[PDB]
Design a protein around this ligand. Sequence first.
Ligand SMILES: Nc1ncnc2c1ncn2[C@@H]1O[C@H](COP(=O)(O)OP(=O)(O)OP(O)(O)=S)[C@@H](O)[C@H]1O
Ligand SMILES: Nc1ncnc2c1ncn2[C@@H]1O[C@H](COP(=O)(O)OP(=O)(O)OP(O)(O)=S)[C@@H](O)[C@H]1O
Ligand SMILES: Nc1ncnc2c1ncn2[C@@H]1O[C@H](COP(=O)(O)OP(=O)(O)O)[C@@H](O)[C@H]1O
Ligand SMILES: [Mg+2]
Ligand SMILES: [Mg+2]
Lengths: 282, 330, 327, 338
Amino acid sequence: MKLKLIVNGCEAPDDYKLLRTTINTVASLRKTAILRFNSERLTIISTPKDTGQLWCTIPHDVFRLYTVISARELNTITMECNCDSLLSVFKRYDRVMNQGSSSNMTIKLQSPICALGITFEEIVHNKVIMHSFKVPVKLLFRAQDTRIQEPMINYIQLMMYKLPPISGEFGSAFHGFIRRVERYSNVNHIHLMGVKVELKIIVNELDWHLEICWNGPLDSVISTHEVIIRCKDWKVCSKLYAAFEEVVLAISHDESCVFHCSLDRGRERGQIIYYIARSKGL
Amino acid sequence: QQPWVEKYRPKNLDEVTAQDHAVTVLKKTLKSANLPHMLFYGPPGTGKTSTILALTKELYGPDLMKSRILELNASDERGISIVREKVKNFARLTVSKPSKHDLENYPCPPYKIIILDEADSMTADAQSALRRTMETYSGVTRFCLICNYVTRIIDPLASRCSKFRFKALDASNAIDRLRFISEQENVKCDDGVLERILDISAGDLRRGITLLQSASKGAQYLGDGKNITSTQVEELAGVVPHDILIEIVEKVKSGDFDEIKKYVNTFMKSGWSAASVVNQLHEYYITNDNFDTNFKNQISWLLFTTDSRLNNGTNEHIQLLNLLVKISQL
Amino acid sequence: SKENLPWVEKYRPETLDEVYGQNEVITTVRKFVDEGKLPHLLFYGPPGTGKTSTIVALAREIYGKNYSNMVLELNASDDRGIDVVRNQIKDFASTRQIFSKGFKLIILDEADAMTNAAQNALRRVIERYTKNTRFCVLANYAHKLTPALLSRCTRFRFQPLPQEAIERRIANVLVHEKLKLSPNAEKALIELSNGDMRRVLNVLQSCKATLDNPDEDEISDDVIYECCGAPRPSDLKAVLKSILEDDWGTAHYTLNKVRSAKGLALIDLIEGIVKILEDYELQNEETRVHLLTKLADIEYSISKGGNDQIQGSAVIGAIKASFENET
Amino acid sequence: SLWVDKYRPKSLNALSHNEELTNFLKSLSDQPRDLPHLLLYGPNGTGKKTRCMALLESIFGPGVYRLKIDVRQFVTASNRKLELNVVSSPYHLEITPSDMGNNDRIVIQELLKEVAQRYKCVIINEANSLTKDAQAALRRTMEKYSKNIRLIMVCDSMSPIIAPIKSRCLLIRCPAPSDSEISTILSDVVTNERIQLETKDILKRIAQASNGNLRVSLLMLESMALNNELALKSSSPIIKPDWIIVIHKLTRKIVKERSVNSLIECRAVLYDLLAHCIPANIILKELTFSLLDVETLNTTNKSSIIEYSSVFDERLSLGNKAIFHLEGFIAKVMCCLD
DNA sequence: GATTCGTATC
DNA sequence: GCTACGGCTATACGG
DNA sequence: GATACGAATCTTTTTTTCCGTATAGCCGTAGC
Ligand SMILES: Nc1ncnc2c1ncn2[C@@H]1O[C@H](COP(=O)(O)OP(=O)(O)OP(O)(O)=S)[C@@H](O)[C@H]1O
Ligand SMILES: Nc1ncnc2c1ncn2[C@@H]1O[C@H](COP(=O)(O)OP(=O)(O)OP(O)(O)=S)[C@@H](O)[C@H]1O
Ligand SMILES: Nc1ncnc2c1ncn2[C@@H]1O[C@H](COP(=O)(O)OP(=O)(O)O)[C@@H](O)[C@H]1O
Ligand SMILES: [Mg+2]
Ligand SMILES: [Mg+2]
């Protein structure tokens, strides 16, 4: 039960941004989060158990040092922590470099309920100001960890859409297309449309209809695909799309929707998957 | 394919049988556009839903129906808030413009119809909110209320809505429809059959059609190619055989509590419904001429009390035993 | 497009002189208007008596063209909770008149459905801003209103429509629609109306629909009974005679034959027999009790449903047993 | 496990206690496309559920018994979590109103809306437990979605089922077997597992002590077999449910002592029975029938008892608190017997 | 409102 | 001079 | 010392509106 890690944001930008995006997403989704510290990767899980699940994979090479030892299988240390305290710590550490610094963030598991000793340094202008934090966490049991599993997705009718990268010419237009439905206050369900490439956002109600359509170029990696989902999950999808260049959208006919985000670190690639159940039936 | 009840559901207003008055009123409403708010009430399986669906089909056609009809039943929430927002918004909506095909093939009335099926399950507050909703928007929206119990509809709504009682479908009322269904489904029956079916199915064509379908399925399974007799019909309808009823009457005649209790235990061990045997006993006792006027009055009141108790979802065994004991002491 | 409307919402009176039946109330409110003083009116009566039509015509007469902004009408279809009463009603009855002077009119249609807290808040608005605003309350049940609200409101009782008002309205409808009505059908229509004009209008529309060719064809009592599905008086008299005089088997046969001839309902026969027996002279006072009680439970059981033949036999037995007390 | 499910006939041809009902089920299963909604009514423990499962196997093939138990969550008009268990199987759904009370309308509404979207058969055990609102939704749900769903509900004493639902279904009666058929089934069971079985008369005793109940008779047989050291005796006592013994003792106390203190003791016994989650309607039924087997009561007392039983079970059906009607019935019996 | 036990006062 | 982010505020939700 | 007086005990898990908190949207100012 000896967990210790060191994070340096300035040394490696992309994976630190991935970690910050994962923390922001799990904080925005719901309170508390599951941190599974496997010996070769760290998985951050937000399980509400209709509401979606976020399964982000963070390789061990992301952090400068990843000593993980426990009596469980493959040194699996599973912990539940409040995202708000971790989010506040990460905001402080982000402002530490924003004011100008390159100090590392040391995290140790100092003692079932434990706490992480997230301590880092900051220099104003040549002064030493030690920032010490202790976030109370609970230690999930081994069987309780086994009760949490990533939901597999069937491929019988599931169809992939390769959304354009946001760094490209069409990326800003596609981001505007995604957020075009967010400017309506009285929207709770978005009914997607894909026929076999077009992505259509349809919001049909008693006395008003909406027909947002994407006329730009799109790719499907390698038939109608309709699923109606809540608007709050679509906000999370839009937030994830902006922070990831490689974004893959999977739509299942009246079953589910999958928002796949991948960060090409090559090296093991960091991936974020947001499984979303249909709010209601077609 | 489909069950005969849904397969032979009327499509036009002409296919609806024995309800001549309401059908004629709706047919004359087709040639006009002054259709009032209708209140369809009557026994179950009398064709109220079929009649309203046929009228809806004839008024607008398959295309304008989706935009000019709103249907709410007991399977969806119909609270005071639902009436105050969804129904009011639909009634306030402007009438959709018919197409050239709709205006050339259908009358296309300048109003729309809101159908509230199973209105007997609606609370009084919802009906109170419905009152001025129908009254204010009567020229742009029409209301149809379908129920089985008139008393569950408040007095102001019964005043606003035109009343259309649906007659119970007896043997003479639906014998033509049953004969047509039997001929179209190639069903062979003896003389007097389908009449016993409509007698058992008291004021119900759905039950009679289901009974005919079950008898036809049994005959097809037998494979002998023989006409269905009334004995088989009574058996799968749940009608107690006349021998068992005769034994019941004979044991009741000898006013012994123990024998009656033992026979009632044996009888309820056979799973017979108390309502059917109570109806059979009522028919036997009222029809028979061996009893005087006072006995008939007392037996009628006792059977009425037993039927009212049974309709309240009470124990069949206790009610049947008490009724038979009271008969034995009459 | 008044030809595209149901007859109930086609003959709604537009002026006060077009409202029949309640002559006293109409004269009183007209005197109120001519004198220039109008109290906080309260209209009470059975449905279809003409309360909404009367108050709407009164408001139109007072404000000929400013009806849109001088009249605030709220009913059960709109939310009338504590917040609506606190905000919207106060804002309406707190500002000055636009240019019509006089007073502001607030109509509370079906105020019996309002909550007690709403009425408690409304009473102070009524008694506070009465200088420039007058309230009208329409209700069919006075037990659902706060006693203070009844205290501060002048009560007007809307009686059920008498015969002559029904005759006049029916004559106007016949003149408008070019229809003919037999006197026997006229008598049948008023009896089934039960002091309700909406029922009369609906039955008249159904009878006009019943006729194969509306013109050159009179509406007889047979047409009325066929359209509305009500038993004829002769059928009721025959059924009562068979029950009272004949034995059990033939009385049951007569009841079954009468009911199956036209598909009549047992509850309608029960109501007809109750109405006929009220005119009977019973010298025991126990027959009355037995009849009323047994028929009441039979009617209640019919309302809950059950076996129809058993209920008919129960009616026959109840009548026979009750009339056995007259010996 | 227990002998009740050990010898449960899985197939349609394995049902050998009704014969005519088996032939009728074969007739129904000949062409499943035109199969209407079915309602099975009869005595408890007859085997109606076994007939339904055998029919489903006759239609959809073996595999209907591959039950997976799932957990479902529902929300009423207000914010509330309803943890309803669902025992689904290929082309088969199971719903029971036992766990859910007055909230039984929204659960069946959501379940039938989701399942209704060939057809999928849905089984509703204990159809009498609905509160006349789930029935109001169900009538339209089955009338409009008859193409993609079929409803087969089992029940006993179908009087509390509303008229439209009974009109929308095929009425199938399942009579309880005779004592000889129960004895034959028990003989087959003891042939499959030898139990000595000194005399054939004890099988008839078990059959007569169950009043035409297969489950109760099998439970009795297993209990005597396990208690008598894997054997049976001609003089072995008849084992009966504990609440039956308690009700019999209550009847004896009522007959013996008729006073206010005895009334309070009877109230305590009724409270214990209610706390043991025994429904009050069958408590009144068993108490009434145990009073009628008392040999020291004349015919007038028995008639008064049965009349009070009818009045008070109607009152309990139209009541809210069950203790009032049970106490009233016991007090009326005491005031009639004295 | 009832019962039961303990005090303060007449 | 423009954009990002923090603070203020209006609205829906919950119990 | 008799009696009036006082204490302790005899007990519990649909609909409307309202009170305070959560949250998203928009404006103003620091920084690039
Ligand atoms: N007059 C009729 N003519 C033809 N078919 C009829 C008639 N009345 C009833 N039916 C048949 O009865 C079945 C059910 O009819 P419905 O109209 O749905 O029942 P219902 O009148 O709504 O009674 P409910 O729903 O219990 S209130 C269908 O198969 C119809 O074809
Ligand atoms: N005295 C009357 N004279 C003429 N028509 C009348 C009269 N009373 C009622 N009516 C007709 O009946 C219709 C309904 O009456 P309303 O006045 O609108 O309702 P109401 O009398 O207020 O009954 P409630 O209590 O509101 S349900 C009117 O639109 C008229 O067509
Ligand atoms: N034909 C039969 N042969 C043998 N056992 C039967 C038969 N029918 C029913 N049973 C027994 O009845 C038991 C349960 O009956 P069940 O289906 O629960 O009755 P119900 O449907 O009335 O509740 C089963 O364990 C089964 O062994
Ligand atoms: Mg219907
Ligand atoms: Mg009105």
